[PDB]
Amino acid sequence: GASGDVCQDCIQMVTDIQTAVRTNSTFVQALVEHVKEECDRLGPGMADICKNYISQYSEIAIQMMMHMQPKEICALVGFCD
Amino acid sequence: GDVCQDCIQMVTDIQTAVRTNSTFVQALVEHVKEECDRLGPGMADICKNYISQYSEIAIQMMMHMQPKEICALVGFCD
Ligand SMILES: CCN(CC)CCC[C@@H](C)Nc1ccnc2cc(Cl)ccc12
């Protein structure tokens, strides 16, 4: 059903994200920089803290993500199971 | 390019799931709240409260945005 379609879509997306992290040298940098820019949407005070949190934990989060299976990442976010 | 299209496909199906499955949103929000426990004591409650404060906003914004817009917002497209 529809929930089942979302799960498979997530597995497909996550598999390709991992292939991008391994084969595209500018992928991670472009994503992290973009998410830092999105911190501006939260507030004047919140944006500075948000940007600092991403800078601090981005590498570890990507490294953690890379040692997980696509279905595990999707089950973690809630798109699978 | 593949990631962008995968995101558009996933987001289109999420919007279909929200419109056709009456328990989808509730199950997702409750699941993400349960995942806050991985942050351990102290941080778990702060995380659960952030979910309870932004879930409606995030879901409504997501339901009124096009799949490509949501994907460009997260950074998977453009
Ligand atoms: C929320 C914190 N995140 C960082 C992204 C840590 C992710 C750690 C866990 C869930 N992932 C996992 C990593 C490795 N094996 C697993 C096996 C099972 Cl059954 C479930 C989850 C697993």
Side-chain angles (χ1 to χ4, degrees), chain A residues 1-47 50-81, chain B residues 1-67 69-78:
Chain A
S3 312
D5 293 337
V6 169
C7 174
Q8 289 302 340
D9 292 344
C10 182
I11 292 166
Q12 189 59 57
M13 187 186 72
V14 178
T15 305
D16 292 337
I17 289 163
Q18 295 189 324
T19 306
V21 176
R22 296 196 185 104
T23 69
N24 184 334
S25 67
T26 58
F27 182 86
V28 171
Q29 173 85 316
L31 182 68
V32 296
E33 66 184 52
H34 178 264
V35 173
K36 281 178 189 180
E37 286 165 19
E38 299 297 349
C39 290
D40 296 330
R41 299 194 176 276
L42 296 162
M46 267 183 237
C50 177
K51 279 170 185 176
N52 276 168
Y53 276 128
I54 278 111
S55 311
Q56 208 183 136
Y57 300 98
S58 68
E59 296 276 70
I60 196 70
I62 277 139
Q63 285 174 345
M64 283 166 101
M65 184 277 286
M66 289 307 288
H67 292 271
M68 285 166 71
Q69 291 178 80
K71 63 188 178 183
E72 291 173 337
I73 295 147
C74 294
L76 172 68
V77 297
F79 298 141
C80 284
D81 293 52
Chain B
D2 290 340
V3 169
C4 175
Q5 192 47 59
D6 291 345
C7 180
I8 291 166
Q9 189 58 56
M10 189 186 70
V11 178
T12 304
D13 292 337
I14 288 163
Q15 296 188 324
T16 305
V18 175
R19 294 196 185 104
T20 69
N21 181 337
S22 67
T23 59
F24 181 87
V25 170
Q26 178 177 67
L28 181 70
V29 175
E30 251 160 69
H31 177 76
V32 173
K33 282 179 188 181
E34 286 166 18
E35 298 296 350
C36 291
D37 295 330
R38 298 193 178 281
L39 304 177
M43 267 183 83
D45 302 307
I46 294 158
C47 178
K48 279 169 183 176
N49 272 93
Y50 273 130
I51 304 310
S52 293
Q53 201 209 309
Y54 284 111
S55 58
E56 196 192 19
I57 303 162
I59 297 278
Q60 289 304 319
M61 281 288 228
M62 183 268 287
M63 287 310 291
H64 294 272
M65 281 166 83
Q66 290 177 80
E69 291 173 337
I70 295 147
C71 295
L73 174 70
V74 297
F76 298 142
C77 284
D78 293 51

